[PDB]
Structure 1
Amino acid sequence: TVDRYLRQPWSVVHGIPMVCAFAPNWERVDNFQSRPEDIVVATFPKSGTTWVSEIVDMILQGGDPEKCKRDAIVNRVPMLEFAAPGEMPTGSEVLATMPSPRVVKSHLPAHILPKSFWDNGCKIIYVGRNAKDVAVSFYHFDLMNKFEQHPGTWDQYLEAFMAGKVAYGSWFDHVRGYWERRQEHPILYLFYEDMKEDLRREITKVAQFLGQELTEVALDAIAHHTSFEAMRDNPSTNYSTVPSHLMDHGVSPFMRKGITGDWKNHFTVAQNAHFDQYYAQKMAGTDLRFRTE
């Protein structure tokens, strides 16, 4: 019954391209009832959502791995806007029966994140990643995720990505939006590259933002269980339990490569030069900066 929604071109909601299966009955997102205690993990897709979600859930468990093994991260951290009409309950429905503090995954741009989150002052942890690696990760993600419009070739996908036509829209608007919205809201704004550089440093910042104290032992336990290699091999976090007819894990696994700089293995010389010129124009007039190396 969900099949008619899969592998369809993007729908649109509030002017933002949307996963086809997610777009119907969008009032469930507009009118989502948040709780003041909700923790929002917000990202442009493929920017480290799963990685930070597992860290957050681990902090809430005091660093105990086994409370995070009992269920897959897609059930422990539902995505707000997820829907699979006729096969699965929506993310919003699932969240209503979760005890507090709810950890809420979402990829919505800040200006269409449900206004309840802003009015309850919910803590938001945003994760940004450099646009080149995001493009690469999101291309391979769409090759394997049947919810997505098929991306065709990489060169055509990169063009769509730069023009903000992919699901959830313009990367440039997405990352700048949450960067500026911290002026009126508590937002911890993390960078994927900083987490590659020094993961324990970034865990400590997440912990302080959530008001949690971590012993030295728990910090090491969290870092040990959120390494790329650990999360790739963990069935609870590597999405290998998602059914085959929704994600073709053989095309590309979710825990694909987990590095910074895989763009160098995908951008052609020409694509790289054209991207850099366009990026520099788009990112002028913001102090927000990312690292590609």
Structure 2
Amino acid sequence: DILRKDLKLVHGYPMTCAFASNWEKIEQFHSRPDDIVIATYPKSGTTWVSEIIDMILNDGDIEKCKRGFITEKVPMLEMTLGRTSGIEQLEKNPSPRIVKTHLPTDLLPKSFWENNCKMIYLARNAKDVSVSYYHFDLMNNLQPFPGTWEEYLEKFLTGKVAYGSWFTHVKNWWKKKEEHPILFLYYEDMKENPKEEIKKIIRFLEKNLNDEILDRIIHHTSFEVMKDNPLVNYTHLPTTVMDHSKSPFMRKGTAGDWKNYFTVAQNEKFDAIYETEMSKTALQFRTEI
């Protein structure tokens, strides 16, 4: 029915088959002014930063952060599956709501701009993203079968994956920085110095948290702890939807993991495409820490 189906176009972007229907519901979504959007290209650290922000908004209270599974606390806007949809769950949530999305800026519901909602756009280097997303498709049965790693990389590089080109996603979101309240963050900076990155989020949300709380947030949101937290590690989803025996959702949590899968030849070809796409932009991603 929806499982292992081909991607469908939605306003020019390839999309997970299940999510591509009744798209008008997404377009008409009603945001609230104090909604906080977490936006990322797939596999860029959405779940990671979702749990960070939840801790922040709950003043570092761990028991509060345990009130529900991640899909209820921080729903994915565009998700639909008979699981309650992301929008239905968002309609049930108290303000300030945290909203996760992978949508290109052009597909984000216009209400979010009209309400001046704050947004955190997190970006991750395209090499680790390709590898994370490949493995994700092995386990996430809503996605097309990715094929071999070599076939998948070619599709990733041409933007023939759900949510389209990493290049376009990152560059278009970056253009929206000057005109809207958006915090731009990088997965590699968060891995390298979570204290300083988390501090950037706390100031952006106009919050005031002491250093004891800050350390507890850092500890509670580290890969080692989150991987074994059943409220955030996606083991709560039906086996039919995500089969973690093919790849766990909390897979490696490393910057540089891409090196383990890219051949030198693949690397040189990637780099050439990357240069063509990205040389004119003032973004400098790190591929290792």
Q: How would you bin the TM-score normalised by the shorter chain? A: over 0.9
| Structure 2 equivalent of residue 10 of structure 1 | 7
Deviation, structure 1 residue 74: 1.2
- Name the CA distance, whole Å, in 2 between partners of 1:190 and 1:138: 19
- Pick from 17, 26, 31: which aligns with 1:29? 26
Q: What is aligned with 2:110?
A: 115
1:33 shift after superposition: 0.5
1:143 to 123, 138, 143: 138
Shift of 1:284: 1.7
- Does 2:223 align with 1:228? yes
Aligned mates of 2:284, 2:44 — CA distance in 1 = 15
The reply on whether 1:42 has 2:42 as its aligned counterpart is: no
Q: 1:210 aligns with which of 185, 194, 205?
A: 205
Equivalent residues in 2 for 1:170-209, closer than 5 Å: 170-209=165-204
Identity of aligned residues (%): 60
Worse-superposed segment, 279-288 or 132-141: 279-288
The CA distance in 1 between the partners of 2:54 and 2:265, in whole Å, is 42
In 2, distance between residues paired with 1:288 and 1:227? 26
Return 92-101 or 254-263, whichever deviates more.
Answer: 92-101
Secondary structure, in 3 states, of the residue corresponding to 1:105?
Answer: strand
**Contact 1:20-1:147 at 8 Å conserved across structures:** yes
Deviations 1:12-61 (A, max 9, x none): 11101111000110001111100000000000000000000000000011
Larger CA deviation: 235-244 vs 100-109: 235-244
Q: Distance in 1 between matches of 2:157 and 2:114?
A: 32
The answer to whether 1:242 aligns with 2:231 is no
Correspondence for 1:69: 66
| Distance in 2 (alpha carbons) for counterparts of 1:74 and 1:232 | 16
Consecutive unaligned residues of structure 1, counting only runs of 5 or more, are: none
Structure 2 residue runs without a partner (length 5+): none
TM-score (norm 2): 0.98
Quick one: distance in 2 between partners of 1:74 and 1:147? 16
Q: Secondary structure at the match of 1:5?
A: coil
Q: Judge conservation of contact 1:42–1:106 (CA < 8 Å) in 2.
A: yes
SS at match of 2:39: strand
Is it true that 1:106 corresponds to 2:101 in the alignment?
yes
Deviation at 1:66, TM superposition (A): 1.4
Partner secondary structure for residue 167 of structure 2: helix
How many residue pairs align between the two structures?
288
Moved over 6 A (4+): none
Residue type matched to 1:181 in 2? K
User: Contact between 1:68 and 1:236, CA under 8 Å: does it hold in 2?
Assistant: no
Provide the residue aligned with 1:277 in structure 2. Answer: 272
**Alignment equivalent of 1:124, drawn from 119, 124, 141:** 119
Corresponding residue for 2:259? 264
Once the two structures are superposed, what CA deviation does each residue of 1:207-253 show, in whole Å capped at 9, x if it has no partner? 11111101111101100100000100111111111110110111100
Deviation of residue 70 (structure 1)?
2.3
Whole-Å Cα distance in 2 between the matches of residues 142 and 111 of structure 1?
24
Q: Residue type of the partner of 1:51?
A: W
Match of 1:53 among 50, 61, 84: 50
Whole-angstrom distance in 1 between the partners of 2:137 and 2:198? 29
Distance, in Å, in 2 between the alignment partners of 1:278 and 1:256 is 27
How far residue 88 of structure 1 moved from its aligned partner, in angstroms, is: 2.5
User: Which of 13, 17, 24 lines up with 1:20 in the alignment?
Assistant: 17
Using the TM superposition, give the Cα deviation of residue 64 of structure 1 relative to its aligned residue in structure 2, in angstroms.
Answer: 1.1
The residue type paired with residue 25 of structure 2 is R
Measure, in 2, the Cα distance between the counterparts of 1:65 and 1:230.
13
Q: Secondary structure at the match of 2:119?
A: strand
Match of 1:166 among 138, 161, 166: 161
| Alpha-carbon RMSD | 0.7
Contact 1:64 1:221 in 2 (8 A): no
SS in 1 for 2:227: helix
